[PDB]
Amino acid sequence: MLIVPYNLPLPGGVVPRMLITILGTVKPNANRIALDFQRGNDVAFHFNPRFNENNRRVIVCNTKLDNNWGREERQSVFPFESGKPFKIQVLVEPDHFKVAVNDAHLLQYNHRVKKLNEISKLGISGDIDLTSASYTMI
Numbered sequence: 001m002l003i004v005p006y007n008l009p010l011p012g013g014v015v016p017r018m019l020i021t022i023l024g025t026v027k028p029n030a031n032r033i034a035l036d037f038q039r040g041n042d043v044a045f046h047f048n049p050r051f052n053e054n055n056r057r058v059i060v061c062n063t064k065l066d067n068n069w070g071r072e073e074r075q076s077v078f079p080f081e082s083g084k085p086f087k088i089q090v091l092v093e094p095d096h097f098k099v100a101v102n103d104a105h106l107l108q109y110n111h112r113v114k115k116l117n118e119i120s121k122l123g124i125s126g127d128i129d130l131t132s133a134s135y136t137m138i
Contacts, residue, residue, distance in 0.1 A: 001132070005125035008133050010037075013117035019138050020090040022124060023131040030082050030127035035090070037097075038121040042066070044113035045097050047090075049080050051127075063112040075107055085131075091138075092116070 008020075014037070026033070035047040043064035050058050057078040063070045079101040080086060091098040096108040113119060124133060 002130040004128060004130050005123060006130055006133060008122040008124065008135075010120050010122055010135070013039075013115075013119045014092045015116060015137075016092055016094045017137050018092045018135055020092075020122065020133075020135045022088040022090075022133045023085070024128040025085045025131070026080055026082050027127040027129065028083050030080075033080070033126035033128055034123075035088070036123040036125070037119050038123060039113055039115065039118045042113065044111075044119045045109055047099065047109075049078065049126075051080070051082065059107065061107070061109050065113075070112065073107075073109065077106065079104065079106060 022035070030051050032051065033049045035045075036043050037045040043062075046060075046062045046064065048060045048062075050060060057080075059075050059078060061073045087102055089100045091100070093108075096110045098108050099106045122133070124130060
């Protein structure tokens with residue numbers, strides 16, 4: 001019920017205890033999903049499930065500064081399935097983003113961009129139907 005790519009403003013940036021919830025369904029022949037938390041043109045946190053990287057499924061996380069990507073962090077645990085509904089929750093903690101998928105902890109990504117109050121947009125793109133995207137404080 002939302003068009004993709006979708007831009008979710010995060011007014012005044014992110015803060016610890018902010019919880020972002022994304023609901024949708026992975027398309028049948030998906031290749032990728034991406035969440036991009038942006039500070040202007042920089043990408044503070046790129047979360048990128050890849051369904052076919054050399055015939056493996058992997059999640060890649062990274063940061064883009066001044067148009068250059070940094071050191072990737074990869075993990076092999078892959079909770080997504082083509083064609084099925086998902087829930088992603090991103091909880092902002094003091095020293096990392098914490099990601100849970102379908103109510104199970106997936107990964108943490110330590111803050112490389114330290115001006116959290118300038119991370120003011122979340123872009124959501126890739127091979128999904130997007131149902132809802134929202135945030136709250138816990």
